[PDB]
Amino acid sequence: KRDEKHRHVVNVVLELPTEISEATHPVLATMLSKYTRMSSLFNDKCAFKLDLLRMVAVSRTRR
Amino acid sequence: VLTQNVLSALEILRLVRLDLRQLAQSVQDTIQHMRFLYLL
Amino acid sequence: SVLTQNVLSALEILRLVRLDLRQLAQSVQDTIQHMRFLYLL
Amino acid sequence: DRQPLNPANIEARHHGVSDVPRLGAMDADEPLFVDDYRATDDEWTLQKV
Amino acid sequence: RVRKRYLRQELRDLGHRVQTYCEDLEGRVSEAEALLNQQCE
Amino acid sequence: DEVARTDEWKGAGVSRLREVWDVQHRVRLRVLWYVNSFWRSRELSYDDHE
């Protein structure tokens, strides 16, 4: 299914704490829509972490 | 037999146009992903 | 010395559109198997 | 890395959306990611100075 | 190294032809719909 | 009178110029295609089997 892989990318790869859920972070779901489309690059989880960080930064720009 | 309503065809054009945008973007994205990951 | 009529002539071209879609799908598959056959080690 | 950079190896980065593989390629060398800007001769001379 | 260079250049090769095919399909669907909805006079 | 091949060669000129690379991708060299080249007319066949 998709629950196993989704929980993989959110927990084993992203290591994000559980208390930040899907509905509490919409850009997280938007990124997870495209994150699962690639099966590689799961060894340097810091890359996914950094992308999530700068996408959060992009979201909060008033411009 | 009578003239078909065109709003269904309107929704169809929008679906097809969005899918063509997706086709171009996805083909380019796949080839660029392969270029960065496997071709270095 | 009005739209339902012309839409059929449009479909006459959309058939060739389908044929070109088939040809491009065949081209892509041919490229993929060719690349797999040659370049991969 | 070794060879001269053909204009195909230089690829501009876009900061707005995604770019996950670009972040993954950070350590790598061969594709020289650049901003889509080119310094003019006057500011080139200013940098040199 | 040479096989990877070949793979790179061949993978890039169809990236533009696919774009041309997509543009042709876009133009054809737009023309078909536009003719169906209205006719230039 | 009669046309010399030099005259039509110069008057027909060239139009396509491409870069070729060695298999190892170590040397760049240019190739010129003169439209009045004799090899054009032989209607030769070309193919590259995988």
From Swiss-Prot, chain A:
Keywords on record: Capsid protein, Host nucleus, Virion
One annotated Gene Ontology cellular component of this protein: viral capsid
Keyword ATP-binding listed: no
Transmembrane parts of this sequence: none
Places the protein is found: Virion; Host nucleus
One record GO biological process: viral process
Function: Participates in the assembly of the infectious particles by decorating the outer surface of the capsid shell and thus forming a layer between the capsid and the tegument. Complexes composed of the major capsid protein and small capsomere-interacting protein/SCP assemble together in the host cytoplasm and are translocated to the nucleus, where they accumulate and participate in capsid assembly.
Family according to the record: Belongs to the herpesviridae small capsomere-interacting protein family.
Summary of subunit composition and partner proteins: Interacts with the major capsid protein/MCP.
Protein name: Small capsomere-interacting protein
Underlying gene: SCP
Interval of the full protein contained in this chain: 13 to 75 of 75
Curated annotation (Swiss-Prot), chain B:
Reported function: Large tegument protein that plays multiple roles in the viral cycle. During viral entry, remains associated with the capsid while most of the tegument is detached and participates in the capsid transport toward the host nucleus. Plays a role in the routing of the capsid at the nuclear pore complex and subsequent uncoating. Within the host nucleus, acts as a deneddylase and promotes the degradation of nuclear CRLs (cullin-RING ubiquitin ligases) and thereby stabilizes nuclear CRL substrates, while cytoplasmic CRLs remain unaffected.
Quaternary data: Interacts with host CUL1 and CUL4A; these interactions inhibit the E3 ligase activity of cullins. Interacts with inner tegument protein. Interacts with capsid vertex specific component CVC2. Interacts with the major capsid protein/MCP.
Compartments it resides in: Virion tegument; Host cytoplasm; Host nucleus
Residues of the full protein shown: 2202 to 2241 of 2241
Top-level taxon of origin: Viruses
The protein's name in its UniProt record: Large tegument protein deneddylase
Family the entry assigns: Belongs to the herpesviridae large tegument protein family.
UniProtKB/Swiss-Prot annotation, chain D:
Compartments reported by the entry: Virion; Host nucleus
Domain of life according to the entry: Viruses
Family: Belongs to the herpesviridae major capsid protein family.
Function of the molecule: Self-assembles to form an icosahedral capsid with a T=16 symmetry, about 200 nm in diameter, and consisting of 150 hexons and 12 pentons (total of 162 capsomers). Hexons form the edges and faces of the capsid and are each composed of six MCP molecules. In contrast, one penton is found at each of the 12 vertices. Eleven of the pentons are MCP pentamers, while the last vertex is occupied by the portal complex.
Subunit comment: Homomultimer. Makes the hexons and eleven out of twelve pentons. Interacts with triplex proteins 1/TRX1 and 2/TRX2; adjacent capsomers are linked together in groups of three by triplexes, heterotrimeric complexes composed of one molecule of TRX1 and two molecules of TRX2. Interacts with scaffold protein; this interaction allows efficient MCP transport to the host nucleus. Interacts with capsid vertex component 2/CVC2. Interacts with the small capsomere-interacting protein/SCP.
Descriptive protein name: Major capsid protein
Residues of the full protein shown: 735 to 783 of 1370
Swiss-Prot record, chain E:
Subcellular location: Virion; Host nucleus
Coiled-coil intervals, chain numbering: none
Known partners and oligomeric status: Heterodimerizes with CVC1. Interacts with major capsid protein/MCP and triplex capsid protein 1/TRX1 at the pentamer vertices. Interacts with the large tegument protein/LTP.
Family: Belongs to the herpesviridae CVC2 protein family.
Biological role: Capsid vertex-specific component that plays a role during viral DNA encapsidation, assuring correct genome cleavage and presumably stabilizing capsids that contain full-length viral genomes. Participates in the interaction between the capsid and the tegument through interaction with the large tegument protein/LTP.
Protein name in UniProt: Capsid vertex component 2
Gene: CVC2
